[PDB]
Amino acid sequence: RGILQLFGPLGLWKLSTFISSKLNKLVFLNIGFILEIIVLSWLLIVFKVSLLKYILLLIIFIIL
Amino acid sequence: QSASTLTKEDVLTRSVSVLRGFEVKTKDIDLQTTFVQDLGMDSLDLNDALVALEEEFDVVFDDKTANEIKTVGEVVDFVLANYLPTEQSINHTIR
Amino acid sequence: MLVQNLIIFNIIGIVLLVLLNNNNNGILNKKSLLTIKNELKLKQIGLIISIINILIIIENWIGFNSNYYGFQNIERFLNIYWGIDGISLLLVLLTLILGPIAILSNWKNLKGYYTYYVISINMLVILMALNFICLDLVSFYILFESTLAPLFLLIGIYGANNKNKAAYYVLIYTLASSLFMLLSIVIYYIIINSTDYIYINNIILSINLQSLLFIGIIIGIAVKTPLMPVHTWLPTVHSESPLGGSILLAGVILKLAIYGVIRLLLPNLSEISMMFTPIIYIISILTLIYSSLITLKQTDLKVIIAYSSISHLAVCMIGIFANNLIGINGSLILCLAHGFVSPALFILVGGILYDRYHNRLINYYQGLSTFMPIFSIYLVVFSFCNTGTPLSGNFVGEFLSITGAVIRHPIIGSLTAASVLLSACYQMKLTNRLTGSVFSQYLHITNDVTNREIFLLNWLLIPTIIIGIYPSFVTNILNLASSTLIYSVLI
Amino acid sequence: MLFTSLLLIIVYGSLVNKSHLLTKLINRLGLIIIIYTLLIHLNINTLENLSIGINMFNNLLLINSFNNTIIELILIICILYVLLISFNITGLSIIDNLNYSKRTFIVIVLFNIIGLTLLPLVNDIMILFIIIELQSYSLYLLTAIFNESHNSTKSALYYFIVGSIASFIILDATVSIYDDLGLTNIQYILMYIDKLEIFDLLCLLFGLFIKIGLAPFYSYSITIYSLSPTIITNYISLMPKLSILTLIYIIMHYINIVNNTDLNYVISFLILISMFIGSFGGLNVIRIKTLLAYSSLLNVSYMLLAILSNSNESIIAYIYYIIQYSLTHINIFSIILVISIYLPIMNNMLNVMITKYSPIEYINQLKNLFINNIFIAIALCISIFSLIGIPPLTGFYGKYLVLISGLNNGYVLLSIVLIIASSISTVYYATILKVLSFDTLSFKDIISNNLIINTSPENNNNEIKPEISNVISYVISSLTLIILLIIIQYENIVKGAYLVLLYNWV
Amino acid sequence: KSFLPHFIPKNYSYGDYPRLKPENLQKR
Amino acid sequence: EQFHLPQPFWPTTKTKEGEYVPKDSIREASKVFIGSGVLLGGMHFRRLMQYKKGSARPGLAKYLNLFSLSKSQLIGFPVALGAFSFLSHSFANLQEGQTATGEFAASSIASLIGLSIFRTKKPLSSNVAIAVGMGSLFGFLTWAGNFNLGDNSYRAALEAGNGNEGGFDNKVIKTERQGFWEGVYRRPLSQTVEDLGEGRGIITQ
Amino acid sequence: SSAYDEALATIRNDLKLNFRFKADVLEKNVIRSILAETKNLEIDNKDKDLDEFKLYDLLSKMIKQRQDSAAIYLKEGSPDRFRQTGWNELREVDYITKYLEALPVASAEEIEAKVEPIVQSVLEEEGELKSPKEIFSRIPWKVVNQDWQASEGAVKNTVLRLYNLYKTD
Ligand SMILES: CCCCCCCCCCCCCCCCCC(=O)OC[C@H](COP(=O)(O)OCCN)OC(=O)CCCCCCCCCCCCCCCCC
Ligand SMILES: CCCCCCCCCCCCCCCCCC(=O)OC[C@H](COP(=O)(O)OCCN)OC(=O)CCCCCCCCCCCCCCCCC
Ligand SMILES: CCCCCCCCCCCC(=O)OC[C@H](COP(=O)(O)OCC[N+](C)(C)C)OC(=O)CCCCCCCCCCC
Ligand SMILES: CCCCCCCCCCCC(=O)OC[C@H](COP(=O)(O)OCC[N+](C)(C)C)OC(=O)CCCCCCCCCCC
C-alpha cells in the first residue's frame, strides 16, 4: 500500500493531474499566444542540433 | 471570459463602503441592515444610495426591485444574480 | 480439424444467442419467452456451447501421440499455423473445463444481462484456449491481449462497488506491460523476417540482444503471473470482478505467463535464460515470501485468496525456470492443480458466503461449521489442498518444483521450501477462524451449500485428487515435450 | 470530371429556388460526381503502370503508385462523408436540417477535393504554393460555412490566421530554395540535392507540420475542432492530414537521399513532444471532440514515425495506417452524430448549454448507450478498442507496422515512447467505454420517456419503425465489421501494400 | 500489570478515522 | 572471476585507445550559459514592452503571463543549463565517452542546482525527487541511443552486410563473436563458457 | 509589530503587480477586500499594536466565511447566470490561504504535534472525553507566542479538530 502505490496508480494519478492541468491552460483561442509559439519554433532551425537536450531540460523546467 | 467573478463577501464589503459615504445613522451595516429604519433614509435619500450602489457594481436595479427593496442583503442578492461583465470589442478577447 | 471447428462453432454460437435475445429489442415493450426465469433458455444454450467446446479438443486428443516429438495436429487457418504438443494439450483442456464451471458459478447471482455475460465468458475461454495452440509470436500476442476487451467490459459491468478501479487496473497494467513484449516480437520479425516457433528456436542472437529481448518479454510475463513488484493490480481485480471472471483469471490467465516462458524464452533465448535464472529466482523467492506475509494482514475475504495465488505462481515460476525435467514437470503439474483449487477457494468465499451475506470483511464470519457443516467440509479440504498437503495435485507440483529448484541452485533454491510453512500460515489462519469459536453474532442462519454449489466444488476437487494420487496421467504426456526445453552441454 | 461537374453545380444551385429539399438533392448530385470521378480514375490509373512515375502538364505534376493510392483513398472517404449530408443521420428535422441549410456545402467540398488530390502530385515549387493555398482556402470557407454561428466564424478566423502564417513559411522555404539554385521544378532541384541547404526543406516541413496540428503548434487545432460543428469537425480534422502527410512522405523521401542526421533529430524532437502532449493532454478533458483532437494529434505522431524512417516497411506501415485510421475516424463521428437522439430533455445546476451545431459535446452525454442501443454501443466500443490498439483489430496492425519501421531504422527511443504514450492515452480511451456501459446493470430498470427520439411521431402503431435511417446505419455496420474482421483478409491487404512503390523498383 | 504488545503505535493520523487508545481485547 | 550478468545495452560505436579527443568543458558550457541568459533576458525585456503596449486587453495579458518567468527562473535556468553542459562534457571526458550513468549524474545534479534557485519555497526532498526524475529521463535518453541509433541500427547493419540477409549456415563456425544484429545456427562452446561460465550444466554438472 | 508591516507590504505590492500586469480580477478583488478588512483592524486594534496573530485571525475569519458561503452555494446552486458564484468563493480562499501561510507562524501540523499529547493525556487521566473544555484548561493561553508560535484562534480550532477525532461519544 506504500511505494508500489507511489510508483503506481495513485502516484501516476497525481502526476497526470499536475501535467494535464498545465496542458489545459495552454489551449485557448488567442492569436498572440499561437503566433509566439510558431515564431519560437524557428529557433530550432537556427540552433545547432547538439542543443536539443538543453531545450528538453528547459521545457521540463517550465512545467514545474 | 464573460462570466461573473463576484463573491457574497466582496459584494457586501463594497456595499458597506458605499453606504458609509452618506449621512447614515449607523456605520454598522450588515445584510439585515434596513435602509428606512437602521439607516434613516427617506424617499430621496434611499434612491440616492441605490443609484450610488448601481455605479459601483455597474448594474441597474429595475423599477419593481428598487421600489420594494428593504434591506442591504436584498441589494447584495440582486447584484450577485444580475451582474455581468460588459462585452468587449473583438480585439480584447481574440488576440 | 481443431481451430477451424472451434472458432466456427463458437462464432455460430455467438450469432445464435445474439439473434434470439436481440430480435424484439425494437421498443416493442414486449415480454417474450426467452427472457423468462432470468433468461434461462439463453443461459442453457451458452452452457451447452461450453460443453461442446470440451468435446472438440477430446476428438483431437484421441489422435495425440505421446511418443512423437514436435507439434501435432498442424493446421493452417486465417493465414496462421496452429499446432499441439504435450504441454499445449493439457493447458487447453484446463481452459475449456473451466468454461461451464465459470458459467455455472453465476447462474442466478447476476442482476441481469445474462446473455452478454454468457457470450463474454465463452469468448474469453476460446480466446485463451487458442493462445495455447498458436505457432508464432505474433499470433501469441494477438490472443494474449485480445482477451482484454471482453474482460474490461465484463469487470466494469458485472463488478462490485469498486469495479471502475478494477477495470482500469486490469486494462492498463496488462497492456502497458504487454507492449514491452510486443517490442521484442517486432525485433524478431525485423532481424529474422519471421516469428515462427520452430524458426526462431534455431537462431542464436548476440548476448547483448538476447538480454534486451529477454527483458522486454519478461516484463509482459512478470506482470501477468504476477510477480512482485508489479502485482498490485491482481488483488484489486479479484476483489471486484464477478465470480466467473475471477475463475477464468485465477484458473487460466495467470497460467499464460508460465506457458509464455515455455514458448517465448526457453527455446529461443536459451543462453540468456541461464544467465537470468538467479535473478528470476531472487524475484520469485521474494514474491513468495512477501506475499505470504502480506496475506497475514488482509481483512478482505476475496483479497486473501488473491494473494494466495501470487505465492503459488511464484513456485511455478521457480520450477519452470529450473534447467531440469523435475522442476519443469512440477511447475506444469502445479499450474494444473492450481487451476482447480484456486477457483474453488473463490467459489467458497466469493460465491457462497458473498451470495448470502454480501460482505467480504473477515470480522463478520466465525464458527460457520455450526450451521454450515457442508460448507466447512469443503473449506477445510480445499484449504489443505491449497497448502500443499499430500494426496492433492498441489503437493506433487510444489514438491517437484522445490526439488527442481534445489537441483538447479542448491543454495538459494532451498528457500523455496519456505512455501510449505508460509502457505499454511495464512491459509489455515483464515480457515481456523472461519470454523472455530461460536457462530458469528452478525450473521443470520440461512441455507447451507446448495446442489449447484456442491456440483462446482466436487468437480473441482476430483481433478486435484486424481492428479495428486496418480500424476502419471499428466507426466506421460509432458515428458517428451518438456525434455526439449532443457539447455545443457555435459562433457 | 470534378472540375467540369463543379461548374454545372455552381450555376444550377444559384438558379433553382432556395429550399432544404433541393439542397439535399443537389448534395446527392455531388455524391454521384465523386462516384463518377472514382470510376474514371480507376479506369485509367493502375498501380502497375504508375510504378515508374509519369510527369504531367509540363512536369508540373508527377503521379506514381504511392500518390495514386492516396487519391483513391481520398475519393472513397469523401464519398462516405457526403453520405452524411446526402441522407438522414437522425431522421429528425430539428437536427438534420442543419446539413441542408447551406447550399454551397457540396460546392466547397468539391473545391477542396480538387486541392486534396493534386497536393501529393506537385512537382514544382510554384504549383506547390498554388495548390497548398487552394486546399487551405477551401478549408477556411468550409469552417465558416455556418456564418450565423459565433463559434464557427471565430474558428475560421483562427484557422485563417494560423494557416496563412504556415503558408508564408512554406512560401519562404520555396523562395529560399529558388534563390540558392534558380530552379523551380522538384526533379531539377533533386539534381542539386547535395548542394542546397537541406534545412530549407525543414522550413518547408515546418509549414506543413503547422497545417496538421503537430506540436508545438497543436493548440489551434484542438481549439478549432472543439468549437466547430461536429459535421464540420469530421471533415477538417481528417481530410487535410490525408494529403499533407502524403506530401511530407515524398519530401522526406527526397531529404533522405543526403541523409542529414541533424534533420532527423529535429523531426524526432517534434514527434517526442507531440506524443507527450497527445497522451497527457486528453487525460483531463470533458468534451468528446476535444478528446478526439488529442487523439488525432497522437495518431499523426505515430504515422510521422513511419514517415521519418522512410524505408520499404514505412510504405507498408503508412499506407495501411492512413487507410484504417480514416475508416475508424469516419465510424466514430458517424456514431456521434446518430446517438444525439438519445439525449434526455430537460423538463438547473451547472447551466449547461447545448446548441444545434454540436448536440453531442461532452463525454458524459454518451451515458447509458449500452441500454439505449446495444449494437451502436458495441460498434463504438470496437472503434475505441481499435484506437487503443487491441488485437486483432485494425488499430493493432497499424501500430504493429509502425513499430516495425521505427525499430528497423533505429528509432528505439521513439518506439518505446510511442508505447508509453499508447498506454497513457488508453486511460481517456477507456473513459469513453466506462461511460457507455459501466452503469448498465443499475440503470436497466429505468424509465426514459424524455429522450429526443421519443418526440418522433409514430406512423400507425403497427409499422415497425426503425430508429435509424437505412444509409447511415448500414455504413456504421459495414465499417465496424471491417475493423473487427480484418484478420480474415489481413494477409492479402498487406500484399497490396507490398506493391505500392515509391521509386523502389529494384 | 498488563502492558500492550510490541509494534503497537502510540499515534496515527489516517485522515478522519477516529483516534482511540489501543486496547488489547484479550485483557477485558 | 567476475559474475556473469546480462548486458541489455544497445550497440554503440567505440573509439580505440588513443582516440576520443576530449571536449573543452569550460568553453562548451560557457556558450550555453551565455546564450541562454541573453535569450531569456532578451525575451523578458521584450515581453515587458508588450505589457506596456497595452494593459487593458485581457487576451494579451493572459498569454503574456504564461510565458513570463520570475527573476529566480531568469537566473536559475541559465545556471542549470550551463551546469548541465559542463557536467555532461566533464563526465564524458572521464569515461572516454558518453554513458547513461554520466548523463543521469549530469542531469540530476544540474537540475538540483537549478531547482535550488527558482524552487526555494519547496522542501529540499521535493527538489531531490524531481532531480532524480529529471536525471532518470535523460539517462533513459542516452540508454536508448539519443534520438536514433544512426549507424548502429539494423538498417545500417543490413546495408553493411552485418545482417541476416544471407541466411544461416551451421557448417561455418566463427571464432569471433557475431554482430549485434547477426544470428547464427551454431556457436563455439568457448563463447558459451565466456557468457555463462562453467557450473550448473555447462561442461560440468 | 513589524512582521505585520512586512506581511501587509507584500499584500499591497501584489495589488500593484496585479493591476500593472492585468492579472486575475478575482485576485484584485481579494487583495482590495483584505485591505478593507485590514483597515478595520487598524481602527479597532489601535493603541494595542498589530501583531501577526491578529492578522492571522483576520485572514482566518475571511476564509471561513467564504467556505460557509461556498458550502451553501454548491448545494443550493449559484444565483448568477453562469453558476460561478460558488466556485468564486473557493478560489478566493486559495488567495487568502496563500497569504495565511506566508505569515511567520507555526503550521497546523506542528500545533497538532503540540496539542495531541495534551489531548491524549486528558483521555488517559480521565478515562473518557466529552468536551474540549477539559482540554482548554491545560492549554497555557499566555505563552503561545514564541513557544508554539501560534495564535488564539489557531490553537482554538486545532483543539476542536483533535477533539472530534478523540471524542468517545
Ligand atoms: C512497479 C510498477 C511501476 C509502474 C510505474 C512506473 C513509473 C512510475 C513513475 C513514478 C513517478 C511518478 C510518481 C510520483 C509522482 C507524484 C507527482 C506528485 O506528487 O505531484 C506532482 C508534482 C508536483 O507536486 P504537487 O502537485 O505539489 O503534489 C504535492 C507533493 N507534495 O509534479 C512534478 O513536479 C512532476 C515533475 C514535473 C512533470 C515532469 C514531466 C516530464 C516527463 C515525465 C515522464 C513522462 C514520460 C512519458 C513518456 C510518454 C510521453 C512522451
Ligand atoms: C523559452 C521559450 C519558451 C519555451 C519553449 C516553449 C515552446 C516549446 C515547447 C513545446 C510544447 C509547447 C507548449 C506550449 C508552449 C509553452 C508556453 C509556456 O511557456 O507556458 C508555460 C506553461 C504554464 O506554466 P504555469 O506555471 O502554469 O504559468 C506560469 C504562471 N506564473 O507551462 C507549461 O505547461 C508548458 C509546458 C508544456 C509541456 C511540454 C512538454 C513537452 C515534453 C517534455 C518531456 C519530453 C517527453 C519525453 C521524456 C523522455 C525523453 C527521453
Ligand atoms: C470470436 C469473435 C467474436 C467477435 C464478435 C462478437 C459479437 C460482437 C457483438 C455484436 C452483437 C451485439 O452487440 O449484441 C449484443 C450481445 C447480446 O447481449 P444482450 O444481453 O442480448 O444485449 C442486451 C439487449 N437486451 C437487454 C434487450 C437483452 O452482447 C454482446 O455485445 C456480446 C458480444 C460482445 C462481447 C465483447 C464486446 C467487445 C468486443 C471487442 C472486440 C476486440
Ligand atoms: C512496466 C510495467 C507496467 C505496469 C503498469 C504500469 C502502471 C499502471 C497504473 C494503472 C493506472 C490506472 O489504473 O489508471 C487509472 C487511474 C485511477 O486511479 P485510481 O485507482 O482510481 O486512484 C486514483 C484516483 N483517486 C486519487 C481519485 C482516488 O488513473 C491513473 O492513474 C491515470 C494515469 C495512468 C497512466 C498509466 C501509464 C503507464 C505508462 C507505462 C509504464 C511506465
Reduce the DSSP state of residue B38 to 3 states and report it. Answer: coil
Would you say the CB of residue C335 lies under 6 angstroms from ligand 4?
Answer: no
Which among C444, C426, C450 is positioned nearest to C352, based on CA atoms? C450
The whole-angstrom separation of Cα D341 and Cα D333 is: 14
Calpha distance E22→E9 (Å, rounded): 8
Provide the resolution (angstroms). 2.8
Q: Are B93 and B1 in contact (CB under 8 A)?
A: yes
How far is Cα D97 from Cα D106, in angstroms, rounded to an integer?
Answer: 15
Cα–Cα distance for residue pair G14/G23, rounded to 1 Å? 10
**Which residue minimizes the CA distance to atom 31 of ligand 1?**
F126
Extract the C-alpha cell encoding G31: 487583495
C409 in Cβ contact with C278 (< 8 Å) = yes
Q: Which three cell numbers stand for residue G40?
A: 478595520
The candidate with the shortest Cα–Cα distance to F67, out of F37, F46, F84, is F46
Instruction: Give me the phi and psi of C136, to 5 degrees please.
Output: -155, 160
Q: How many CA atoms lie within 13 A of F57 on its CB side?
A: 19
Ligand 3 atom closest to the Cα of residue C114 is: 20
d(CA F108, CA F130): 8
- Show the DSSP H helices in D389-411 as ranges: 394-408
Per CB-CB distance under 8 Å, the chain G contacts of B13 are: 33, 36-37
Q: Is D408 in Cβ contact with C112 (below 8 Å)?
A: no
Mind telling me how many Å the CA of E25 is from chain G's nearest CA? 17
Q: Decide if B93 touches G, using CB distance below 8 A.
A: no
What does the alpha-carbon distance between residue D382 and residue D363 come to, in Å, rounded to a whole number?
17
Q: How many CB atoms lie within 10 A of CB D256?
A: 16
Residue with cell 473441482: C460
C470: phi then psi, degrees, rounded to nearest 5: -130, 75
D412 touching F (Cβ < 8 Å): yes
**Quick one: which of C374, C388, C225, C209 has its CA closest to C309?**
C225
Q: Find chain F residues with C-beta within 8 A of D269's C-beta.
A: 147
User: In this structure, what C-alpha cell is assigned to residue G149?
Assistant: 508560535
DSSP 8-state symbol, F176? S
- DSSP assignment of C152-205 equals HHHHHHH--TTHHHHHHHHHHHHHHHHHHHHHHHHHHHHHSS--BHHHHHT-B-
C338 in the Ramachandran plot: left (φ > 0), alpha (ψ -120 to 50) or beta?
A: alpha
Q: Is the CB of F132 under 6 A from ligand 1?
A: no
Phi, psi dihedrals of residue D344, rounded to the nearest 5°: -65, 155
Q: Of the residues C7, C9, C11, C18, which should be mutated to test ligand 3's pocket, given the most ligand atoms within 8 Å of the CB?
A: C18
Angle at G168 between CA G166 and CA G169, to 5 degrees: 125
Residues sharing a CB contact under 8 Å with residue C386, sequence separation 6 or more, in sequence order: C308, C312, C341, C342, C345, C394, C423, C427
Query: Which residues are CB-neighbours of D307 under 8 A, at least 6 positions away?
Result: D245, D248, D249, D252, D314, D318
% helix, strand, coil for chain D, step of 5:
70, 5, 25
Look up residue D344 and give its DSSP letter: B
For ligand 1, atom 51: residue with the closest CA = D276
d(CA C387, CA C375): 18
Question: Which residues, 6+ apart, have CB-to-CB distance to E9 below 8 Å?
Answer: E22
The minimum CA-CA distance between D262 and chain F, rounded to whole Å, is: 10
* Cβ–Cβ below 8 Å for D410 and F152: yes
- Nearest CA-CA partner of C485 in C279, C330, C323: C323
Query: For residues C367 and G83, what is the distance between their CA atoms, to the nearest angstrom?
Result: 56
DSSP H helices, chain B, are 8-19, 43-57, 63-66, 72-82, 90-93
Q: Which three cell numbers stand for residue G144?
A: 503561545
Q: Which grid cell sits at C88? A: 499445449
Indicate the SS3 state at residue F118: helix
Q: Is the peptide bond before D457 cis (omega within 30 degrees of 0)?
A: no
d(CA C341, CA C398): 14
Closest among G43, G54, G33, G64 to B28, alpha carbons compared? G43
Task: Collect all residues from D whose CB is shorter than 8 A from any CB in G.
Answer: 349-351
> Which residues of D make CB contacts under 8 Å with C?
370, 374-375, 381, 385, 388, 390-392, 396, 400, 403-404, 407-408, 415-416, 419-420, 422-423, 426-427, 430, 433-434, 437-438, 440-442, 444, 464, 466-467, 487-488, 490-491
Closest by CA to C300, choosing from C362, C243, C346, C231, is C362
Give CA–CA dist F64/F47, Å, rounded: 7
- Which candidate in B10, B30, B38, B42 is catalytic? B42
Chain F contact set for B1 (CB, 8 A): 58
Number of H helices, E strands in chain E: 0, 0
How far is residue C464's CA from residue C333's CA, in Å, rounded to a whole number? 10
Please say if B42 is a catalytic residue. yes
Instruction: Please report how many Cα atoms fall inside a 13 Å half-sphere around the Cα of residue D380, on the Cβ side.
Output: 29
Asked if residues D382 and D480 have their Cβ atoms less than 8 Å apart, the reply is yes
Of D424, D109, D157, the residue nearest D279 (C-alpha): D424
Residues of G with CB under 8 A from a CB of D: 77, 81-83
Please name the chains neighbouring F, where neighbouring means 3+ C-beta pairs under 8 angstroms: A, B, C, D, G
For atom 36 of ligand 1, the residue with the nearest CA is: F130
Q: Which of C347, C351, C372 is nearest to C434 (CA)?
A: C372
Who's near D378: CB < 8 A, 6+ residues apart? D480
- Could you give phi then psi for residue C401, rounded to 5 degrees? -65, -45
Q: Please report where in the chains the cell 498545465 appears, as a residue.
A: A22
Query: Is G84 in contact with B4 (Cβ distance < 8 A)?
Result: yes
Residues of G in contact with B9 (CB under 8 A): 33, 62, 65-66, 69, 89, 92
8 Å CB contact of B94 and A30: yes
Q: Do G and C make contact, counting contact as 3+ CB pairs within 8 angstroms?
A: no
Taking CB atoms within 8 Å and a gap of at least 24, the contacts of A51-56 are: A51/F32, A52/D265, A52/D266, A52/D269, A52/F147, A53/F138, A53/F141, A54/F32, A54/F36, A54/F81, A54/F84, A54/F85, A55/D269, A56/D269, A56/F138, A56/F141
